Design a protein around this nucleic acid. Structure first.
Lengths: 474, 479
DNA sequence: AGAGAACTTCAACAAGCCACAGGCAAACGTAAGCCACATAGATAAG
DNA sequence: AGAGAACTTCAACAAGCCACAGGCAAACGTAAGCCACATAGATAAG
């Protein structure tokens, strides 16, 4: 049970040996820090101890094809083994899910994201079922649902309407998912509404044009080396694409203004206002933290919806320090939010926020709809229920910086039989498909020019095993 | 020398746990196949036996920055230890170096490439020295000269008369190299000649874009799934893409014609005469074999370009069934050869081809010029039918007749001919160590691309330079 | 030339106690300056 | 009462020889997948 520290001589031998390895095989440096690699260290040490130093190492080495075959097989056995746990989680309505479709840049396959979210014990579950490519049939949503049910049948799950789905507004996706409770992706809604608000205000375009010319010059003239922070592009696919350029402008301000002064580019900066930049940064920092709080995986994010409304309507409300253009922007933002966000928000969002222990947030008319939905869900999952609802109205809870609604409800689960189960059912719902596009990002990470011959089954096997190893290993 | 065996259960758990690691680490399956991999495994097994089982790993395994420090230290140690042998190679007049420029695609740095080749003992050493940054200077021949002097003085080299260069016709390239040896790149010149040949024949202009649009239609519309040898686009930055794409289209002709029949787009393929395609492939087969001949490094390639001139003039000889368009193409190709190839040739290639044991092939003024050049060099490097003298060495080598054996390698032939012709053999080992073109530079760039990656940004230039140098050293001095 | 066997007579060593003080000899204290590997932050690709 | 010391007799009895029955782990030929490595080969990119 006690590790035996060795003399530094074997240590130096290890250092030189691994330097030779890293140079010869030409691998990224951090691969030594891989925890699985450290497990390899333990395994080879023990086999050396139990067989000596006069062994045949080579015959113990398998072939990579056998590696791939064993990977796919073990994927099959482990997915079969966890099918039972997933079915148990689904039956009690404890599970939610998000989906999307992904494409690479080499073969352009129609890969679909299948992620299942729920909660077990005191760890918030979040599972990636598998990325199955649709192949090439006109990318029809009919084939999408066919392959979807093929995926679900791999775990013996044939019911979907009870699963709560948080997805964006893809036409075919929403068309097919109208049979399911469709929740708009809060992050995607924020990005789209922000883009709509920006496109309604040309009064920022002229400094935007100047900044775009600045960044083009920076990526062209090759002068980023003397900034300590290289300028970034927009990349509209990137979330909060304006925030990154606002940062790379305001933060680098001193160095960039000095180098444009010393490079004879005073023309590039005569059309820029600092006050507007600082006001917009002060407005957009809240938006960035809304993004990060709505992209939380190991924490519930559906309870953020109405506090997000409060924070936005406080931020978007006109102030004294705004310009006429900025006040016009704020009015446009108010119009867009009232026609999109609150228009599309519905009973699920307010009800999921309601279970937060300070239930005095929405003392307005929304309590009626929230109570009706709570009664319906109590029937679905079924001290009395309405008595529970009334006694919850008697509860007052003080916020603390480390307070969690989940632990609070579970410690009140001893007092409340089924409303706590309702809370965990609602708390297991992220407010966005951030996990879905992160799965897409991971798939992009595993794909590369040298990896253009991979098979789809191998890919979804790898990602499922990675998710299982992340979530159910202690 | 006997080796032992483990239980099958041990092998099974090895499979299980290595799969666990690789799925956790998300690494390509080629990693286990590495030779350094099994080297480290053997070291681990030896240490585990020597130390037991309840031996800690966490303390033993170092930190990545420690690794970078140790790699730089080992690189500089090998630099110091090998600079002396490399200097001996420098003044043994058998050294060949590569020079080029390359820009990154993430940070867009400017890098000057220097490597070195030499022959010692029964092996041709191929060492990649360094791809050093030019910082952000004006990128002139002065910065290039400073960088190359710094590169070589890092290995205690200050004179560059003996070194022999092969490179392209860049502006700075022709600007700086006027003071030392210069040879034009065979690959760059060959690609330029192919582009000229296809440009000067107007009749074959439209099939190029026709085939490119065919590939584009089969690409963008997700039309590559049922194609056995799927088509790909040009990527003209590469070498002879057009012929390879045409070959692939000719290969898949059956699939594509039935696909057009089933899809009602037969008008896409009916616009091209197939006989044109067979004519193109029949002409270009010898060209592609020449392509594959010139790229050799572990075997000589400088000397195998004039016999490629022989092969071209054999191919460029007029045919009977060649269309008038094909006759125009071949006449234009002959003109391009006359105006480019012999224009860019130097005495290096003639001297390299001369050492072919049946020297009777080039019995012209060429061998006389080669004799004068070799006599000058040997007077610098130092009828009597015994070798005795360099002039008599050439006189005796002239009359030699050797069979065209199929498995003939001139390397060991001259190695055992050094007993007969010592100084001429030294000239041979000097000449053969020169690749004809700069394909090694692109190989080094490919290695860099294996190093530099979208996720592998933000690496110091000295670090990567040491990595590539040490890797080349190991591929030079490890048995 | 035996042979066993016990006896005074010197008188002659000798193992067996102490007294004790003088090493060299194993092992524990500071100190100690070169390392040098371990510990937290920006930062580009995303 | 006792001495200490050699013969004399059955004697039986616990050491070694012997070696046909009954028994057993060890060795060998066979056969069924079998199945996990091992081979080239191609296929894209670079």
């Amino acid at each position: 049970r006690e590790l035996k520290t060795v003399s530094a001589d074997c240590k130096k031998e290890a250092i030189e040996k691994c330097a030779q390895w890293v140079v010869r095989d030409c691998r990224p440096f951090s691969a030594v820090s891989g925890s699985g690699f450290i497990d390899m260290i333990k395994f080879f040490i023990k086999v050396g101890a139990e067989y000596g130093e006069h062994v045949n190492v080579e015959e113990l080495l398998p072939s990579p094809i056998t590696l791939s075959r064993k990977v796919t097989s073990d994927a099959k056995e482990k997915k079969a083994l966890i099918s039972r746990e997933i079915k148990s989680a689904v039956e009690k309505d404890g599970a939610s899910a998000t989906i999307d479709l992904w494409t690479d840049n080499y073969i352009k396959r129609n890969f679909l994201g299948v992620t299942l979210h729920y909660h077990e014990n005191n760890e918030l579950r979040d599972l990636i079922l598998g990325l199955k490519s649709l192949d090439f049939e006109r990318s029809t949503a009919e084939n999408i649902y066919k392959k979807l049910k093929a995926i679900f049948s791999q775990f013996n799950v044939e019911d979907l309407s009870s699963i709560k789905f948080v997805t964006d507004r893809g036409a075919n996706v929403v068309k097919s998912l109208a049979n399911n409770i469709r929740i708009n992706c809060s992050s995607h809604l924020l990005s789209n509404v922000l883009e709509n608000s920006f496109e309604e205000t040309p009064e920022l375009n002229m400094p935007i044009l100047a900044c775009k010319n600045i960044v083009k010059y920076f990526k062209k003239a090759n002068l980023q080396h003397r900034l300590r922070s290289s300028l970034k592009s927009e990349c509209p696919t990137r979330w909060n694409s304006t925030y990154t350029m606002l940062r790379s402008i305001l933060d680098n301000w001193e160095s960039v203004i000095q180098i444009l002064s010393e490079a004879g580019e005073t023309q590039r900066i005569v059309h820029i206002n600092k006050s507007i930049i600082q006001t917009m940064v002060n407005i957009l920092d809240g938006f960035e933290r809304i993004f990060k709080e709505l992209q939380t995986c190991s924490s519930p994010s559906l309870c953020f919806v109405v506090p997000s409304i409060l924070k936005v309507k406080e931020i978007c409300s006109p102030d004294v320090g705004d310009v006429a253009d900025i006040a016009k922007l704020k009015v446009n933002i108010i119009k867009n939010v009232r026609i999109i966000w609150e228009e599309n928000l519905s009973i699920w969002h307010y009800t999921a926020f309601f279970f937060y222990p300070p239930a005095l947030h929405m003392q307005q008319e929304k309590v009626a709809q929230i109570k009706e939905f709570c009664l319906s869900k109590m029937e679905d999952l079924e001290v009395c229920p309405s008595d529970e609802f009334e006694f919850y109205r008697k509860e007052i809870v003080i916020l603390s910086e480390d307070f969690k609604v989940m632990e609070w409800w579970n410690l009140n689960s001893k007092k409340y039989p089924k409303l706590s189960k309702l809370a965990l059912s609602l708390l297991s719902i992220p407010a966005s498909s951030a996990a879905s596009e992160r799965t897409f990002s991971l798939a992009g990470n595993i794909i590369t020019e040298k990896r253009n011959r991979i098979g789809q089954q191998t890919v979804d096997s790898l990602l499922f095993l990675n998710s299982f190893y992340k979530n159910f290993c202690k």
